[PDB]
Design a protein around this ligand. Structure first.
Ligand SMILES: *[C@@H]1O[C@H](CO)[C@@H](O)[C@H](O)[C@H]1NC(C)=O
Ligand SMILES: *[C@@H]1O[C@H](CO)[C@@H](O)[C@H](O)[C@H]1NC(C)=O
Ligand SMILES: *[C@@H]1O[C@H](CO)[C@@H](O)[C@H](O)[C@H]1NC(C)=O
Ligand SMILES: *[C@@H]1O[C@H](CO)[C@@H](O)[C@H](O)[C@H]1NC(C)=O
Ligand SMILES: *[C@@H]1O[C@H](CO)[C@@H](O)[C@H](O)[C@H]1NC(C)=O
Ligand SMILES: [Cl-]
Ligand SMILES: [Cl-]
Ligand SMILES: [Cl-]
Lengths: 284, 289
């Protein structure tokens, strides 16, 4: 049975699609053998406790572009084979219970962008050893706590840009030894701990532009061994004695890096740091 | 002019006392000269923002034993001289905005016990540098995030018992250099990071009884130079080779420590670990195991 104006088909995968159908909640009568459920584009307010427990074969679930305000902690419980979970474009969700994603040992990608998330609870990403893609962009995140991604061993892409992150602690990115791309641009990053990127050995892309970075020690870039692209523009760079560590590292870096424009001093008229001579940096 | 009912007296402190009067909300027209406001015992469900502005000289605010459901983020904005805030016994409050306590640089004691608090948001205790007493007991806390009390450099008492805290991370208690009594009993504590007490040099009392502690490294108690009272009862202690580090630390501890009862093995059941011989702490029942 198809739960109404939905569309139900079996090839290639057992699919139940209910997109842009004025649904006010998760409909009743979804086939228990479904492997793909698309509830995007409706006005679903709450995801109750039961929801999708019947679908033991479920791997793809889309709930984006709804009116999600509350998601029960047991919303996706027992969905052992879930590979993709889409909750993006729900700017009125604001908060997720830290046990919501417990038990999803097969989850490959998790979309949580433009959800207005105020914070990331302790243990929110615990156990997600299968996670590869994590989208947390354009939320209201105001802190990046330690060990938040300690279990994401297979995580390759992490998107944190478009938040209000003020700093980076030491063990914030602990455990991400498979991370390839890390995007932190368009935040309020004013400081980074010297040893933050220690686990990022295979990181190839780092976007730090459009932040509040005044200076950056070379030590934070030392562990990055596979780095091939680096974005640092749109930052209040102070080019003097404090920039010499980053300056020396930038003369040796092999990959393609963006401009490092000096906000200060006034004498240096908005020039690139990589192209400055050693004798320009004075003023620790 | 004092509001309806209530009590307003000048000495010792300018007081607007309206307790146990059946108020449904904060009474309007509270005198601006008030140094102490007692609204406890009523049925106030919400506290709007700026509800106590104009009361610049306010130092004491009691809102306990009410029916609080939501506190506005700017409820205490402008209370630069508030010394004591009492929000306890509101087990339906559940959540407090992490910016609610910003600016209260003179706050000395903060009562948040029996509020139904579920978690502690980032920066909830930002800049509370004068805070000395923090009552967070008998709530629904499920985690003690790192750096939660990093700003509370003048805190001497921290009450966390009666929650459901499962562990103590590495930096849960960082920045608490003045801490005297830390109470963590009646929780779900199963493991403590060896360096969780690194900044607690002046600690004199530590309660850890009634938890699920199977073992405790000797390094966790190493920073506690000033310890005089330590409670470890009501824990499932495994008294085998893993307890030798804790056992040796207990042989040189000069303070008063409670009983450390053995859950396993059954031949040592309820024997005090301190009073066992080293030859008892052999075998297994886990590097040594
Ligand atoms: C899962 O799919 C198989 C076929 O691949 C089917 O036989 C089985 O009944 C399905 N079970 C559920 C719970 O959907
Ligand atoms: C995660 O990595 C482990 C090896 O560390 C591997 O066995 C497992 O298949 C990986 N899972 C995914 C979803 O990539
Ligand atoms: C606070 O008290 C001082 C003197 O004790 C007085 O000058 C000031 O006006 C008082 N403020 C208010 C709001 O009553
Ligand atoms: C902290 O307490 C000490 C006394 O132990 C006192 O001297 C100091 O002024 C206090 N600091 C603040 C910011 O309240
Ligand atoms: C018992 O200890 C375990 C750790 O082995 C912990 O996960 C669990 O929450 C504890 N339960 C209780 C009731 O203390
Ligand atoms: Cl797809
Ligand atoms: Cl840290
Ligand atoms: Cl319980």
């Amino acid at each position: 049975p198809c739960p109404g104006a939905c569309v139900c088909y079996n090839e290639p995968k057992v699919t139940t699609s209910c997109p842009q159908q004025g649904l006010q909640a998760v409909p009743t009568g979804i086939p228990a053998s479904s492997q793909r459920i698309f509830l995007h584009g409706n006005r679903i307010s709450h995801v109750p406790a039961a929801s999708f427990q019947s679908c033991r074969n479920l791997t793809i679930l889309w709930l984006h572009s709804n009116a999600l305000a509350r998601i029960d902690a047991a919303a996706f419980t027992g969905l052992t084979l879930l590979e993709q979970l889409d909750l993006s474009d729900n700017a009125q969700l604001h908060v997720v219970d830290p046990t919501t994603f417990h038990g999803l040992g097969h989850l490959h990608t998790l979309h949580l962008d433009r959800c207005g998330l105020r914070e990331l609870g302790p243990g929110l990403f615990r156990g997600l050893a299968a996670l590869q893609y994590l989208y947390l962009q354009d939320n209201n995140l105001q802190a990046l706590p330690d060990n938040t991604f300690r279990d994401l061993g297979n995580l390759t892409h992490l998107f944190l840009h478009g938040n209000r992150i003020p700093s980076v602690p030491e063990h914030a990115f602990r455990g991400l030894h498979s991370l390839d791309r890390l995007l932190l641009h368009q935040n309020h990053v004013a400081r980074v701990h010297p040893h933050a990127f220690r686990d990022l050995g295979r990181l190839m892309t780092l976007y730090l532009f459009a932040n509040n970075l005044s200076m950056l020690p070379a030590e934070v870039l030392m562990p990055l061994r596979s780095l091939q692209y680096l974005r640092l523009n749109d930052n209040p760079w102070v080019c003097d004695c404090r920039a010499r560590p980053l300056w020396a590292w930038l003369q040796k870096f092999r990959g393609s890096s963006s401009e490092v424009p000096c906000n200060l001093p006034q004498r240096l008229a908005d020039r690139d740091l990589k192209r400055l001579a050693a004798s320009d940096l004075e003023g620790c």
